[PDB]
Design a protein around this ligand. Sequence first.
Ligand SMILES: CC(C)(COP(=O)(O)OP(=O)(O)OC[C@H]1O[C@@H](n2cnc3c(N)ncnc32)[C@H](O)[C@@H]1OP(=O)(O)O)[C@@H](O)C(=O)NCCC(=O)NCCSCC(=O)c1ccc(O)cc1O
Ligand SMILES: CC(C)(COP(=O)(O)OP(=O)(O)OC[C@H]1O[C@@H](n2cnc3c(N)ncnc32)[C@H](O)[C@@H]1OP(=O)(O)O)[C@@H](O)C(=O)NCCC(=O)NCCSCC(=O)c1ccc(O)cc1O
Lengths: 136, 136
Amino acid sequence: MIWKRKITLEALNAMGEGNMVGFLDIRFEHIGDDTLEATMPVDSRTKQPFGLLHGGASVVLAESIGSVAGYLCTEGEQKVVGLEINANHVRSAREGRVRGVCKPLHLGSRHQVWQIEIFDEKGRLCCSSRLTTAIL
Amino acid sequence: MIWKRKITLEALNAMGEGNMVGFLDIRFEHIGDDTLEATMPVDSRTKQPFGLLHGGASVVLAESIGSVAGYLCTEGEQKVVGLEINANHVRSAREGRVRGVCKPLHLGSRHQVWQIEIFDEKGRLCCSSRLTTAIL
Ligand SMILES: CC(C)(COP(=O)(O)OP(=O)(O)OC[C@H]1O[C@@H](n2cnc3c(N)ncnc32)[C@H](O)[C@@H]1OP(=O)(O)O)[C@@H](O)C(=O)NCCC(=O)NCCSCC(=O)c1ccc(O)cc1O
Ligand SMILES: CC(C)(COP(=O)(O)OP(=O)(O)OC[C@H]1O[C@@H](n2cnc3c(N)ncnc32)[C@H](O)[C@@H]1OP(=O)(O)O)[C@@H](O)C(=O)NCCC(=O)NCCSCC(=O)c1ccc(O)cc1O
């Protein structure tokens, strides 16, 4: 496994309480040996004014999963912050929940790179994102 | 003057009601002849679990300003969607509100490129972002 920090799904989900992760109902649903997965609803909290999932909301999901994945790949008092984030909005979503799957592209001593793909309920790719973190 | 749609600040702010823009108290504060400005709080709705402004929240602001600027540079039943987004998190924001300033880099027939810079209350740059839209 890639993780250096051991965490339960419960404890991972508790991290979001009282911050943006909790406010957007972002829910971590699976911790794999080398992947992390979370879902997020498409509703008033995350839509843009024309009824689509807000592009920014997709990026919130991507940066949330990638950043905490990165954090879990550090140890002790190391911190991880997002340094650069990018995404392509390949398909819109209008309802239900979307699901982001995060995998590592680079796990360095000082930086990491994470790939997050976000799918709708039909397994259709909606957002492809890449996140670069800095380890502090 | 780049705009093709005439809109008041009040009507522009009205667009965000019932969606993520209003939820996060993103407020448009100035419409220039070639710039658009909106602010966003740094609080429990937009922070990450360690107290910083969530990287994705910065992108929510960038996409919210850039996409509607894009829309305001089209006419009639034309639609604008975010296609590609990138953002550099160069300084953390921790309190108050951040201020996003959006300027056009390219205004095309079927695509636009928008630059959004987001500053903290002390005027320091915190996020530098580029949004590419498609006109439908
Ligand atoms: C349009 C693309 C960007 C490019 O692919 P392509 O080759 O150019 O075109 P495709 O052939 O692949 O067609 C794809 C689908 O598009 C539909 N459509 C076509 N024509 C029209 C039309 N005239 N009218 C309507 N729809 C049309 C088609 O029916 C088609 O459906 P299907 O055939 O599949 O049934 C596509 O990748 C896409 O939609 N990505 C998601 C974009 C996204 O959700 N971004 C994030 C959200 S927007 C930013 C935001 O958050 C934001 C924030 C605040 C704010 O104030 C405002 C804000 O905007
Ligand atoms: C520290 C950098 C990463 C590199 O800086 P650089 O290349 O050297 O550039 P500068 O030389 O200009 O330095 C600038 C200022 O920074 C200070 N500074 C330097 N070193 C340290 C340090 N070790 N500690 C503290 N401060 C440090 C410097 O002293 C200087 O301060 P001043 O004295 O001038 O007042 C900086 O670019 C940065 O903080 N970007 C924002 C990151 C961010 O907020 N991302 C988004 C949020 S995190 C991701 C997320 O959303 C997320 C979501 C869910 C989740 O579960 C978890 C999540 O994490």
